[PDB]
Amino acid sequence: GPSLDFALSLLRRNVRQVQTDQGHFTMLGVRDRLAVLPRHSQPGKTIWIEHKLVNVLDAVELVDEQGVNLELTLITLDTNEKFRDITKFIPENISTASDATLVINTEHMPSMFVPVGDVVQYGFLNLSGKPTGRTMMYNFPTKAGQCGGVVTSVGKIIGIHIGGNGRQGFCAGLKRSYFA
Numbered sequence: 238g239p240s241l242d243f244a245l246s247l248l249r250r251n252v253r254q255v256q257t258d259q260g261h262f263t264m265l266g267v268r269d270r271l272a273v274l275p276r277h278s279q280p281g282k283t284i285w286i287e288h289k290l291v292n293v294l295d296a297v298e299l300v301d302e303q304g305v306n307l308e309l310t311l312i313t314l315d316t317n318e319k320f321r322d323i324t325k326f327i328p329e330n331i332s333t334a335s336d337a338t339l340v341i342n343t344e345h346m347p348s349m350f351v352p353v354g355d356v357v358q359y360g361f362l363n364l365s366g367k368p369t370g371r372t373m374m375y376n377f378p379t380k381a382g383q384c385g386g387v388v389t390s391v392g393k394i395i396g397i398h399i400g401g402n403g404r405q406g407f408c409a410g411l412k413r414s415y416f417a
């Protein structure tokens with residue numbers, strides 16, 4: 238319905254399959270040549286995007302005001318093409334949601350929509366030994382959720398999937414100011 242209508246339009250215009258030396262990831266293009274990935278993707282000086290070799294001009298791993306990892310990496314891509322600007326769909330404050338859909342898009346898991354249900358505030362989380370901040374939690378019973386993913390609700394882009402414990406998954410919450 239309307240939730241999936243938004244998620245589908247986001248996929249088409251803003252969610253891309255990428256590959257780094259760390260594997261296959263879902264990338265969210267935010268605007269212009271600016272995109273975001275889970276930090277564990279560890280993008281290098283070049284990246285594969287939809288089967289094309291793209292230079293990475295800048296890569297910034299985001300931290301909070303204490304320097305705590307947010308598990309998000311902002312990259313600026315060496316390209317002429319521009320992403321549709323979706324920042325107006327990213328909330329000003331990290332937001333929970335009901336009936337959320339996780340959009341995964343990698344070469345091995347293309348154009349995949351996963352209903353995760355309610356996304357709830359969690360906060361500080363030790364993610365595979367790395368203290369992380371500003372996380373949210375949802376049901377996601379897989380041990381292989383290590384490809385990123387875009388968490389959406391009706392007309393809102395609320396998180397980037399960063400991992401899980403085999404029962405629940407967790408996302409790094411998105412705020413509009415990250416992309417200002």
Ligand SMILES: */C=C/C(=O)N(C)Cc1nc2c(s1)CCCC2
Nearest residue numbers: 341346351379381382383384385
């Ligand atoms: C790294 C991609 C990812 O998130 N994986 C492989 C975990 C998932 N497995 C399935 C998903 S997401 C949705 C459909 C069922 C299998």
